[PDB]
Design a protein around this ligand. Structure first.
Ligand SMILES: CCCCCCCCCCCCO[C@@H]1O[C@H](CO)[C@@H](O[C@H]2O[C@H](CO)[C@@H](O)[C@H](O)[C@H]2O)[C@H](O)[C@H]1O
Ligand SMILES: CC(C)CCC[C@@H](C)[C@H]1CC[C@H]2[C@@H]3CC=C4C[C@@H](O)CC[C@]4(C)[C@H]3CC[C@]12C
Ligand SMILES: Fc1ccc([C@@H]2CCNC[C@H]2COc2ccc3c(c2)OCO3)cc1
Ligand SMILES: *[C@@H]1O[C@H](CO)[C@@H](O)[C@H](O)[C@H]1NC(C)=O
Ligand SMILES: *[C@@H]1O[C@H](CO)[C@@H](O)[C@H](O)[C@H]1NC(C)=O
Ligand SMILES: [Cl-]
Ligand code: NA
Lengths: 218, 544, 214
């Protein structure tokens, strides 16, 4: 139905510029204001500004005046947001959200765009299989894991067997240290499917465009 | 012998209410509350009054004083003061024409509304009409409704697709043809001013009795009406909330100066003409003082009259009245305010007295507007004129009709803006500036104080003196420079005017000004002797 | 401008209980407040618009009330999947501002933490490193102590604790205790032990393994 597909994550050096797209679909694109909301880590939502797709009627925020530039294309129904003079504060998640003129609510949002502003080198993640020992007591359920060590930025995705199944997967948040992140993943699966069948964790790092798959071995 | 001395006013109150009638118009109603609530809110009162005291009042009283003292027209008074600036009287005559081309079309709109308000159910309430689109969405209709960029209200649809039919024009380029209804409306207007001006000050002074008193009544009714409305405190809050930081803006003062000037309109020769037909013994100082204080206070209460209803309208919707008050102009009264009074009990009443109030506001101002020019030409071409007054009045009026034919078009509204912003404003300021400088410097402010000293019996204060010598020409000079420096990109109804419009505007701005330097050239070219001799005799007034 | 203030950054409730989040605005707003529900890792979802009106696709258990400055978002039957951060937002004056955000934490009965210790893989030993892991799954509340023991001695250096957010199914927190060490130091010790102290029981849960090929 109504979908707002934004662009992927971006790692950019301070002082440079960055552009974010927003492919809108499922509705009449010219019938609604296109807004952009900023969300800092652990902070609240922050309205950057809107734009009228008809004539490019941009209405910015005083806090973002000269900081953000909204554009629009009707030929492909896609709204863009450009940012210049990038700092550490701009390192936040950005959403493009549809809104009527009245009442001015944000009915449909985008999936989000993770922006990281740092001069730190793009570091590939180290994937190390976290398997239980051979001396452990096999109970009604076995917990497995996969370790991701030393990568940048926080853009990473750990999947398990093409997302089937994952009804008991505990994913642990990334921790930052010495300019590199480190996270871990776990999954609780019964003992009647291990080590009989095949279980493999997939670690994907979009910023470095890498994908390492590791199968668990006892 | 024969005619000789000119006629006089039938009563003091007649011409008092007459100049009050001229002073008060549309702009007093919607212009001042907008520019006020926009520029620092209530704090806007602080510079506005100043620009009045230091700027508006001195020009006003000077114009009036010259008028009652010399008893001459806008052209003939320069013959006996500074002949070279006689062209001033001509310039105004052109200016007024440019003003009379759009000013009465607005009243024609209000008249179309007035005659369209006799129906039990007002047209701009429903969407089931012959001019509404599929975008037309109205109330007493399904709730939860969510407005769309392309959606349009039945009032906006009514004003847009019917009385204006502005959708039938692509802009200034293609605006034809003519909406004959507004032609009949403005024809009726030219008729009702024709029968209110043709005889002179005797009739005008009596029609003004109605045209100048009724607007206050209607403002009182809409005042007590808007006050009893729920959530009306929002518009008043937004209207008088002090934003002293906005006083730091160098612009606001300009807005205030321009506002008070163009709502008092001194040096336009109309006040001169209205003052011409009065007693020499009669005082005019008190007159000017109070009179001004009326155009102004009237504006102040008009602010409440508008923003109470705008507040209620912002209450039925969702607040930030500024949003419901984004667009300033004819749309504020003809769309927002009309749609606002539409959702009120006995809406036919408030509608009729509302648009009737608009017409009633424009009528008197128009009376005086033509009256000044007519008086000017009659006094300039006496005997050569006055065979009948209805002849010349008929001529200038039908001339104003043919002038308004460009404005009666579909894109006419466009022109209304183009003429209101580009043409008139800068020039009048200019001719007012030249006039003030010519009376204060050329004629000598000393001899002027001697004339007032012979008029009222006492010489005018040093305050008025320093105001006339310096403060007032600086007051006009300010608005002149600020205007020229920043000509306005102007927009109307989701349509930005072409880049070249200003050029066109400047034409309309200069086509009225070309007469005075060419008249100076005609005088200095005709006057024998040397430049200092001919210019010295041209600086010196008529001996007889 | 307008300041939307959510005085309570956190609010505790239980499954099935009646919860209500407040929202304070700078000035009078009449009935122009919208409530959004942002689940961890998802985009903000519109629930309420214009104080009381619900948006399409929003369950009956979500309601809104208030008119003026103080506004209230009410949930009668809190579910496990209702775990999210709720924001309130004004929609009348430019610019549109949001509330600070009220994170809704779910209160339930205590749960025993399933602890599982993990030995360094060969792939990590090849690189020259060795990290002993200690998973703590399905427990409540968040407050829990984790103590490490390399060889009976309390290890405190090189320990990183990572708490996840609450669960959307059983509402149970889960954390990971990581002990990163070098290969040389790893091959000089045998039986590793990680223990956890929770309020569920006085006796800490102790997990241990041997380096000598498990
Ligand atoms: C203030 O000044 C006046 C009115 O006060 C307006 O701006 C003015 O400037 C231009 C400059 O040529 C004039 O031609 C025009 O008549 C007028 O609109 C605007 O409202 C704002 O600029
Ligand atoms: C009253 C008289 C003296 C004013 C004439 C001044 C002339 C030069 C001005 C007035 C109106 C102006 C025109 C207004 C309309 C258009 C159409 C546009 O597609 C090209 C510009 C153009 C062609 C302008 C050119 C300049 C213009 C012709
Ligand atoms: F340029 C300016 C001319 C006149 C003003 C006046 C200021 C005070 N209130 C009335 C304003 C307009 O009055 C009219 C109405 C019809 C007219 C007219 C003037 O001239 C010929 O046709 C302001 C500015
Ligand atoms: C509604 O307006 C849009 C543009 O404002 C227009 O394209 C559309 O045709 C209109 N709808 C109808 C039914 O005319
Ligand atoms: C509420 O209004 C929107 C406007 O787009 C409409 O799509 C929706 O159907 C309305 N709700 C209901 C229940 O009809
Ligand atoms: Cl005023
Ligand atoms: Na006026």
């Amino acid at each position: 139905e109504v979908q707002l597909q934004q662009s992927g994550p971006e790692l950019v050096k301070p002082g440079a510029s960055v552009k974010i797209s927003c492919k809108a679909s499922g509705y009449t694109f010219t019938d609604y204001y296109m807004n952009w909301v900023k969300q800092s880590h652990g902070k609240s939502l922050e309205w950057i500004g809107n734009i009228n797709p008809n004539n490019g009627g941009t209405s910015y925020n005083q806090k973002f005046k000269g900081k953000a530039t909204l554009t629009v294309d009707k030929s492909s129904t896609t709204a863009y947001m450009e940012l210049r003079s990038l700092t550490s504060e701009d390192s936040a998640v950005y959403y493009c959200t549809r809104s009527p003129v009245r009442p001015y609510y944000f009915d449909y949002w985008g999936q989000g765009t993770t922006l990281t502003v740092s001069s730190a080198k793009t570091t590939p993640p180290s994937v190390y299989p976290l398997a239980p020992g051979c001396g452990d007591t096999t109970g009604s359920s076995v917990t497995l894991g996969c370790l991701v060590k030393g990568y940048f930025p926080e853009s990473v995705t750990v999947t398990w067997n093409s997302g089937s199944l994952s009804s008991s997967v505990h994913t642990f948040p990334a921790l930052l240290q010495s300019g590199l992140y480190t996270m871990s993943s776990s999954v609780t699966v019964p003992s009647s499917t291990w080590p009989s069948q095949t279980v493999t964790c997939s670690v994907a790092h979009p910023a470095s465009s890498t994908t390492v798959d590791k199968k668990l071995e006892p | 012998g024969s005619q000789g001395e000119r006629e006089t006013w039938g009563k003091k109150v007649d011409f008092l209410l007459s100049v009050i009638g001229y002073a008060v118009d549309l702009g007093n109603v919607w212009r001042f509350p907008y520019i006020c609530a926009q520029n620092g809110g209530g704090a806007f009162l602080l510079p506005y009054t100043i620009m009045a005291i230091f700027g508006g009042i001195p020009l006003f009283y000077m114009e009036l004083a010259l008028g009652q003292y010399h008893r001459n027209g806008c052209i003939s008074i320069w013959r006996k003061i500074c002949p070279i600036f006689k062209g001033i009287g001509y310039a105004i005559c052109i200016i007024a024409f440019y003003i009379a081309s759009y000013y009465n079309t607005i009243m024609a709109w209000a008249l179309y509304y007035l005659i369209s308000s006799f129906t039990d159910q007002l047209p701009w309430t429903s969407c089931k009409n012959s001019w509404n689109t599929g975008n037309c969405t109205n109330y007493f209709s399904e709730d939860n409704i969510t407005w769309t960029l392309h959606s349009t209200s039945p009032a906006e649809e009514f004003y847009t697709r019917h009385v204006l039919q502005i959708h039938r024009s692509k802009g200034l380029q293609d605006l034809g043809g003519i909406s004959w209804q507004l032609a009949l409306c403005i024809m009726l207007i030219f008729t009702v001013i024709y029968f209110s001006i043709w005889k002179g000050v005797k009739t005008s002074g009596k029609v003004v009795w109605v045209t100048a008193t009724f607007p206050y009544i209607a403002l009182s009714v809409l005042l007590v009406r808007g006050a009893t409305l729920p959530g009306a405190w929002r518009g008043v809050l937004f209207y008088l909330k002090p934003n002293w930081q906005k006083l730091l803006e160098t612009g606001v003062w300009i807005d205030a100066a321009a506002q008070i000037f163009f709502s008092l309109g001194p040096g336009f020769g109309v006040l001169l003409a209205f003052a011409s037909y009065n007693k020499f013994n009669n005082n005019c100082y008190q007159d000017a003082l109070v009179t001004s204080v009326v155009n102004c206070m009237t504006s102040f209460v008009s602010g409440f009259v508008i923003f109470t209803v705008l507040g209620y309208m912002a209450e039925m919707r969702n607040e930030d009245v500024s949003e419901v008050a984004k667009d300033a102009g004819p749309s504020l009264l003809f769309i927002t305010y009309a749609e606002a009074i539409a959702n009120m009990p006995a809406s036919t009443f408030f509608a009729i007295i509302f648009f009737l109030m608009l017409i009633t506001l424009g009528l008197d101002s128009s009376f005086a507007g033509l009256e000044g020019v007519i008086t000017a030409v009659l006094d300039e071409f006496p005997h050569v004129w006055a065979k009948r007054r209805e002849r010349f009045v008929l001529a200038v009026v039908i001339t104003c009709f043919f002038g308004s034919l460009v404005t009666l078009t579909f894109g006419g509204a466009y022109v209304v803006k183009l003429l209101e912003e580009y043409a008139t404003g800068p020039a009048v300021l200019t001719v007012a500036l030249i006039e003030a400088v010519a009376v204060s410097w050329f004629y000598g402010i000393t001899q002027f104080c001697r004339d007032v000293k012979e008029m009222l019996g006492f010489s005018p204060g040093w305050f008025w003196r320093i105001c006339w010598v310096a403060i007032s020409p600086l007051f006009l000079l300010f608005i002149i420079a600020s205007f020229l420096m920043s000509p306005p990109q102007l927009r109307l109804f989701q349509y930005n005017y072409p880049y070249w419009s200003i050029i066109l505007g400047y034409a309309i701005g200069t086509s009225s000004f070309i007469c005075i330097p060419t008249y100076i050239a005609y005088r200095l070219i005709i006057t024998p002797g040397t430049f200092k001799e001919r210019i010295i005799k041209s600086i010196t007034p008529e001996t007889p | 401008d307008i300041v939307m203030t959510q005085s309570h950054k956190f609010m505790s409730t239980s499954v099935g209980d009646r919860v209500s989040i407040t929202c304070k605005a700078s000035q009078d707003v009449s009935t122009a407040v919208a409530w959004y529900q942002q689940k961890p890792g998802q985009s903000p979802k519109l629930l309420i618009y214009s104080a009381s009106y619900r948006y399409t696709g929003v369950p009956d258990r979500f309601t809104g009330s208030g008119s003026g400055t103080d506004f209230t978002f009410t949930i009668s039957s809190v579910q496990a999947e209702d775990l999210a951060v709720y924001y309130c937002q004004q929609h009348y004056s430019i610019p549109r501002t949001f509330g600070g955000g009220t994170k809704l934490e779910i209160k339930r009965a205590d749960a025993a933490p399933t602890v599982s210790i993990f030995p360094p893989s060969s792939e990590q030993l090849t690189s020259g490193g060795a990290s002993v892991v200690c998973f703590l799954n399905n427990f409540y509340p968040k407050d829990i102590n984790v103590k490490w023991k390399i060889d009976g001695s309390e290890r405190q250096n090189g320990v990183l604790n990572s708490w996840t957010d609450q669960d959307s199914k059983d509402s149970t927190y889960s954390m990971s205790s990581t002990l990163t060490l070098t290969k040389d130091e790893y091959e000089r010790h045998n039986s590793y032990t990680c223990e956890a102290t929770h309020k569920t029981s006085t006796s800490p849960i102790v997990k241990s393994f041997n380096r000598n090929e498990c």
